[PDB]
Protein backbone atom coordinates (compact mmCIF):
# COMPACT_ATOMS: atom_id res chain seq x y z
CA UNK A 1 0.00 0.00 0.00
CA UNK A 2 1.22 3.48 0.89
CA UNK A 3 4.08 2.19 3.05
CA UNK A 4 7.22 1.39 1.07
CA UNK A 5 10.60 -0.11 1.94
CA UNK A 6 12.31 3.29 2.00
CA UNK A 7 9.71 5.09 4.10
CA UNK A 8 8.79 8.01 1.83
CA UNK A 9 5.32 9.56 1.72
CA UNK A 10 5.22 9.59 -2.09
CA UNK A 11 2.29 7.16 -2.42
CA UNK A 12 -0.10 8.98 -0.11
CA UNK A 13 -3.18 11.16 -0.34
CA UNK A 14 -2.23 14.63 -1.59
CA UNK A 15 -5.46 16.45 -0.56
CA UNK A 16 -6.23 16.86 -4.28
CA UNK A 17 -7.25 13.26 -4.92
CA UNK A 18 -9.44 13.56 -1.82
CA UNK A 19 -11.27 16.51 -3.37
CA UNK A 20 -12.12 14.45 -6.46
CA UNK A 21 -13.61 11.65 -4.35
CA UNK A 22 -15.96 14.01 -2.53
CA UNK A 23 -16.94 15.77 -5.76
CA UNK A 24 -18.03 12.50 -7.40
CA UNK A 25 -19.47 11.13 -4.11
CA UNK A 26 -17.42 7.92 -4.23
CA UNK A 27 -17.91 7.32 -0.49
CA UNK A 28 -21.67 6.77 -0.13
CA UNK A 29 -23.19 3.41 0.80
CA UNK A 30 -26.63 1.95 0.18
CA UNK A 31 -28.22 1.72 3.66
CA UNK A 32 -27.30 -1.97 3.97
CA UNK A 33 -24.41 -3.66 5.75
CA UNK A 34 -22.68 -6.99 5.24
CA UNK A 35 -20.67 -8.59 8.02
CA UNK A 36 -17.65 -8.59 5.70
CA UNK A 37 -17.87 -4.90 4.80
CA UNK A 38 -18.53 -3.61 8.33
CA UNK A 39 -14.83 -2.89 8.83
CA UNK A 40 -14.78 -0.28 6.05
CA UNK A 41 -17.76 1.69 7.41
CA UNK A 42 -16.84 4.70 9.53
CA UNK A 43 -20.32 6.06 10.26
CA UNK A 44 -23.89 6.47 9.09
CA UNK A 45 -25.39 9.69 7.73
CA UNK A 46 -29.02 10.78 7.51
CA UNK A 47 -31.59 8.77 5.53
CA UNK A 48 -29.83 5.58 6.64
CA UNK A 49 -26.99 5.83 4.11
CA UNK A 50 -23.55 4.79 5.37
CA UNK A 51 -20.34 6.51 4.32
CA UNK A 52 -16.97 4.87 3.71
CA UNK A 53 -13.62 5.57 5.32
CA UNK A 54 -11.40 7.50 2.92
CA UNK A 55 -8.02 6.42 4.29
CA UNK A 56 -9.16 2.79 4.26
CA UNK A 57 -10.61 3.09 0.76
CA UNK A 58 -7.57 4.89 -0.66
CA UNK A 59 -5.14 2.47 0.98
CA UNK A 60 -6.78 -0.54 -0.68
CA UNK A 61 -6.72 1.22 -4.05
CA UNK A 62 -2.94 1.62 -4.04
CA UNK A 63 -2.48 -2.02 -3.04
CA UNK A 64 -4.54 -3.10 -6.05
CA UNK A 65 -2.40 -0.94 -8.35
CA UNK A 66 0.83 -2.48 -7.04
CA UNK A 67 -0.56 -5.89 -8.02
CA UNK A 68 -1.66 -4.89 -11.52
CA UNK A 69 1.68 -3.18 -12.10
CA UNK A 70 3.46 -6.26 -10.72
CA UNK A 71 2.41 -8.34 -13.72
CA UNK A 72 4.36 -7.55 -16.87
CA UNK A 73 1.93 -8.50 -19.66
CA UNK A 74 -1.12 -6.19 -19.74
CA UNK A 75 -2.91 -8.52 -22.15
CA UNK A 76 -2.92 -11.09 -19.34
CA UNK A 77 -5.13 -9.10 -16.97
CA UNK A 78 -8.80 -9.28 -17.94
CA UNK A 79 -11.35 -6.65 -16.91
CA UNK A 80 -15.01 -7.64 -16.94
CA UNK A 81 -18.24 -5.77 -16.28
CA UNK A 82 -21.92 -6.67 -16.47
CA UNK A 83 -23.58 -3.37 -15.54
CA UNK A 84 -23.92 -1.19 -18.63
CA UNK A 85 -22.79 1.92 -16.75
CA UNK A 86 -19.28 0.54 -16.32
CA UNK A 87 -19.03 -0.55 -19.95
CA UNK A 88 -17.55 2.72 -21.19
CA UNK A 89 -15.09 3.07 -18.32
CA UNK A 90 -13.41 -0.32 -18.72
CA UNK A 91 -12.93 0.47 -22.41
CA UNK A 92 -11.11 3.73 -21.71
CA UNK A 93 -9.21 2.04 -18.89
CA UNK A 94 -8.07 -0.83 -21.11
CA UNK A 95 -6.63 1.33 -23.88
CA UNK A 96 -4.51 3.47 -21.55
CA UNK A 97 -3.17 0.49 -19.60
CA UNK A 98 -3.11 -2.08 -22.40
CA UNK A 99 -5.13 -4.84 -20.74
CA UNK A 100 -7.78 -7.08 -22.24
CA UNK A 101 -11.40 -6.43 -21.35
CA UNK A 102 -14.92 -7.71 -21.88
CA UNK A 103 -18.34 -6.27 -21.10
CA UNK A 104 -21.90 -7.51 -21.10
CA UNK A 105 -23.05 -11.05 -20.42
CA UNK A 106 -20.39 -13.53 -19.33
CA UNK A 107 -20.52 -16.73 -21.38
CA UNK A 108 -20.36 -19.71 -18.98
CA UNK A 109 -17.46 -22.01 -19.68
CA UNK A 110 -15.23 -19.18 -20.89
CA UNK A 111 -12.50 -20.12 -18.40
CA UNK A 112 -13.28 -23.84 -18.09
CA UNK A 113 -14.30 -25.19 -21.51
CA UNK A 114 -10.95 -25.60 -23.26
CA UNK A 115 -12.32 -27.01 -26.52
CA UNK A 116 -14.37 -23.87 -27.22
CA UNK A 117 -12.96 -20.97 -29.16
CA UNK A 118 -12.53 -17.76 -27.17
CA UNK A 119 -11.14 -19.90 -24.36
CA UNK A 120 -9.06 -17.53 -22.21
CA UNK A 121 -6.65 -18.05 -19.31
CA UNK A 122 -6.01 -14.74 -17.54
CA UNK A 123 -3.93 -14.49 -14.40
CA UNK A 124 -5.73 -11.60 -12.66
CA UNK A 125 -9.42 -10.72 -12.92
CA UNK A 126 -11.01 -7.34 -12.18
CA UNK A 127 -14.77 -6.89 -11.84
CA UNK A 128 -17.07 -3.95 -11.24
CA UNK A 129 -19.52 -5.61 -8.87
CA UNK A 130 -19.30 -9.02 -7.17
CA UNK A 131 -23.08 -9.52 -7.12
CA UNK A 132 -23.71 -8.92 -10.82
CA UNK A 133 -20.46 -10.58 -11.95
CA UNK A 134 -20.96 -13.69 -9.82
CA UNK A 135 -20.70 -15.98 -12.83
CA UNK A 136 -17.19 -14.82 -13.70
CA UNK A 137 -16.12 -14.94 -10.06
CA UNK A 138 -17.46 -18.47 -9.68
CA UNK A 139 -15.60 -19.71 -12.75
CA UNK A 140 -12.38 -18.09 -11.56
CA UNK A 141 -12.49 -20.23 -8.42
CA UNK A 142 -11.97 -23.40 -10.49
CA UNK A 143 -8.74 -22.44 -12.29
CA UNK A 144 -6.69 -20.66 -9.59
CA UNK A 145 -7.35 -17.05 -10.57
CA UNK A 146 -7.21 -14.25 -7.98
CA UNK A 147 -9.76 -11.47 -8.37
CA UNK A 148 -10.02 -7.77 -7.51
CA UNK A 149 -13.43 -6.18 -7.08
CA UNK A 150 -15.16 -2.85 -6.52
CA UNK A 151 -17.40 -3.65 -3.57
CA UNK A 152 -20.23 -1.55 -2.16
CA UNK A 153 -21.50 -1.72 1.42
CA UNK A 154 -23.76 -4.75 0.87
CA UNK A 155 -21.38 -6.79 -1.12
CA UNK A 156 -20.84 -10.56 -0.94
CA UNK A 157 -17.10 -11.18 -0.53
CA UNK A 158 -17.27 -14.91 -1.26
CA UNK A 159 -14.34 -15.39 -3.66
CA UNK A 160 -12.95 -11.85 -3.55
CA UNK A 161 -9.31 -11.52 -2.53
CA UNK A 162 -8.75 -7.75 -2.71
CA UNK A 163 -11.84 -5.56 -2.30
CA UNK A 164 -11.82 -1.83 -3.02
CA UNK A 165 -14.67 -0.22 -1.03
CA UNK A 166 -16.42 2.40 -3.15
CA UNK A 167 -19.74 3.36 -4.74
CA UNK A 168 -19.98 0.98 -7.69
CA UNK A 169 -23.55 2.19 -8.29
CA UNK A 170 -23.84 5.47 -10.16
CA UNK A 171 -22.31 6.72 -13.38
CA UNK A 172 -20.08 9.37 -11.83
CA UNK A 173 -18.35 7.20 -9.23
CA UNK A 174 -17.41 4.36 -11.59
CA UNK A 175 -15.69 6.70 -14.02
CA UNK A 176 -13.72 8.43 -11.29
CA UNK A 177 -12.54 5.20 -9.67
CA UNK A 178 -11.17 3.72 -12.90
CA UNK A 179 -9.53 7.02 -13.85
CA UNK A 180 -7.67 7.10 -10.53
CA UNK A 181 -6.69 3.44 -10.83
CA UNK A 182 -5.37 3.93 -14.37
CA UNK A 183 -3.40 7.00 -13.31
CA UNK A 184 -1.83 5.23 -10.33
CA UNK A 185 -0.61 2.15 -12.21
CA UNK A 186 0.93 4.39 -14.88
CA UNK A 187 3.07 6.41 -12.47
CA UNK A 188 4.03 3.15 -10.76
CA UNK A 189 5.08 1.69 -14.11
CA UNK A 190 7.31 4.65 -14.93
CA UNK A 191 5.40 6.84 -17.36
CA UNK A 192 3.56 10.08 -16.50
CA UNK A 193 5.68 10.19 -13.33
CA UNK A 194 5.81 13.98 -13.62
CA UNK A 195 4.10 15.93 -10.85
CA UNK A 196 2.01 17.71 -13.51
CA UNK A 197 -1.64 16.55 -13.50
CA UNK A 198 -2.58 13.81 -15.94
CA UNK A 199 -3.53 15.19 -19.35
CA UNK A 200 -6.37 12.70 -19.88
CA UNK A 201 -9.75 14.05 -18.80
CA UNK A 202 -12.11 11.96 -16.67
CA UNK A 203 -15.07 12.75 -18.94
CA UNK A 204 -14.03 10.05 -21.42
CA UNK A 205 -14.75 7.43 -18.74
CA UNK A 206 -18.38 8.45 -18.16
CA UNK A 207 -21.14 6.34 -19.67
CA UNK A 208 -23.01 8.10 -22.46
Amino acid sequence: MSAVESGSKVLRMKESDAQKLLAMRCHIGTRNQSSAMKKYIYGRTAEGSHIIDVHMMWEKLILAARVIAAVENPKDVCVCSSRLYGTRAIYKFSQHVGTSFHGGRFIPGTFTNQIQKKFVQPRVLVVTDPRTDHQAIREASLVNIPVIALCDTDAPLEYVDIAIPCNNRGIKSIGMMYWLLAREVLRLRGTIVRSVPWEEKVDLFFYR
Binding site: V4, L11, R66, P156, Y159, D161
Partner: protein, 85 residues
Protein backbone atom coordinates in the same frame (compact mmCIF):
# COMPACT_ATOMS: atom_id res chain seq x y z
CA UNK B 1 15.59 -30.05 6.79
CA UNK B 2 11.91 -30.37 5.86
CA UNK B 3 10.50 -33.81 5.13
CA UNK B 4 11.12 -37.40 6.17
CA UNK B 5 14.67 -38.75 6.29
CA UNK B 6 15.65 -42.38 6.70
CA UNK B 7 18.49 -43.37 9.00
CA UNK B 8 20.81 -43.53 5.97
CA UNK B 9 20.55 -39.72 5.77
CA UNK B 10 18.72 -39.41 2.46
CA UNK B 11 15.39 -37.63 2.02
CA UNK B 12 12.64 -40.09 1.11
CA UNK B 13 9.79 -37.63 0.52
CA UNK B 14 8.22 -37.21 -2.91
CA UNK B 15 7.68 -33.45 -2.56
CA UNK B 16 6.89 -30.84 0.08
CA UNK B 17 3.49 -29.13 -0.38
CA UNK B 18 3.05 -25.45 0.34
CA UNK B 19 2.03 -24.42 3.86
CA UNK B 20 -0.40 -21.52 3.95
CA UNK B 21 0.63 -18.28 5.63
CA UNK B 22 -2.84 -17.57 7.04
CA UNK B 23 -4.32 -20.98 7.92
CA UNK B 24 -1.07 -22.97 8.45
CA UNK B 25 -2.67 -25.93 6.63
CA UNK B 26 -1.12 -27.85 3.76
CA UNK B 27 -2.37 -27.04 0.27
CA UNK B 28 -3.20 -30.24 -1.57
CA UNK B 29 -2.65 -31.12 -5.21
CA UNK B 30 -6.35 -30.91 -6.14
CA UNK B 31 -7.34 -27.66 -4.45
CA UNK B 32 -7.82 -25.57 -7.64
CA UNK B 33 -9.03 -22.61 -5.57
CA UNK B 34 -5.74 -21.74 -3.88
CA UNK B 35 -4.02 -18.74 -5.46
CA UNK B 36 -0.73 -16.86 -5.36
CA UNK B 37 -0.47 -13.07 -5.49
CA UNK B 38 2.62 -10.99 -6.24
CA UNK B 39 2.88 -7.40 -4.99
CA UNK B 40 5.55 -5.15 -6.47
CA UNK B 41 8.10 -3.32 -4.33
CA UNK B 42 8.33 0.38 -5.18
CA UNK B 43 11.49 2.42 -4.69
CA UNK B 44 11.73 5.78 -2.93
CA UNK B 45 11.41 7.71 -6.19
CA UNK B 46 7.99 6.16 -6.75
CA UNK B 47 8.56 3.44 -9.34
CA UNK B 48 8.99 -0.31 -9.07
CA UNK B 49 12.48 -1.71 -8.52
CA UNK B 50 11.89 -5.06 -10.23
CA UNK B 51 11.19 -7.20 -7.15
CA UNK B 52 7.93 -8.58 -5.77
CA UNK B 53 6.66 -10.37 -2.68
CA UNK B 54 4.49 -13.48 -2.92
CA UNK B 55 1.56 -14.67 -0.80
CA UNK B 56 -0.36 -17.95 -0.79
CA UNK B 57 -3.97 -18.47 0.30
CA UNK B 58 -5.62 -21.85 0.79
CA UNK B 59 -8.77 -22.65 -1.15
CA UNK B 60 -11.20 -23.12 1.73
CA UNK B 61 -10.44 -19.66 3.11
CA UNK B 62 -11.70 -18.22 -0.18
CA UNK B 63 -14.89 -20.27 0.11
CA UNK B 64 -15.87 -18.81 3.48
CA UNK B 65 -15.34 -15.27 2.20
CA UNK B 66 -12.56 -14.56 4.71
CA UNK B 67 -9.77 -14.34 2.12
CA UNK B 68 -10.01 -10.55 2.00
CA UNK B 69 -9.65 -10.28 5.78
CA UNK B 70 -6.58 -12.52 5.82
CA UNK B 71 -4.86 -10.40 3.16
CA UNK B 72 -5.31 -7.24 5.24
CA UNK B 73 -3.57 -8.74 8.27
CA UNK B 74 -0.67 -10.19 6.28
CA UNK B 75 0.14 -6.96 4.44
CA UNK B 76 0.30 -5.02 7.71
CA UNK B 77 2.70 -7.55 9.23
CA UNK B 78 5.01 -7.12 6.23
CA UNK B 79 4.80 -3.33 6.46
CA UNK B 80 3.19 -3.11 3.02
CA UNK B 81 0.08 -1.43 4.46
CA UNK B 82 -0.28 1.23 7.14
CA UNK B 83 -3.03 1.69 9.76
CA UNK B 84 -4.96 4.54 11.45
CA UNK B 85 -4.22 7.90 9.76
Amino acid sequence: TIGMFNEEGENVDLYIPRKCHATTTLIEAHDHAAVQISIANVGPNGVINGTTTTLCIAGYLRSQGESDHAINHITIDRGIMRIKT
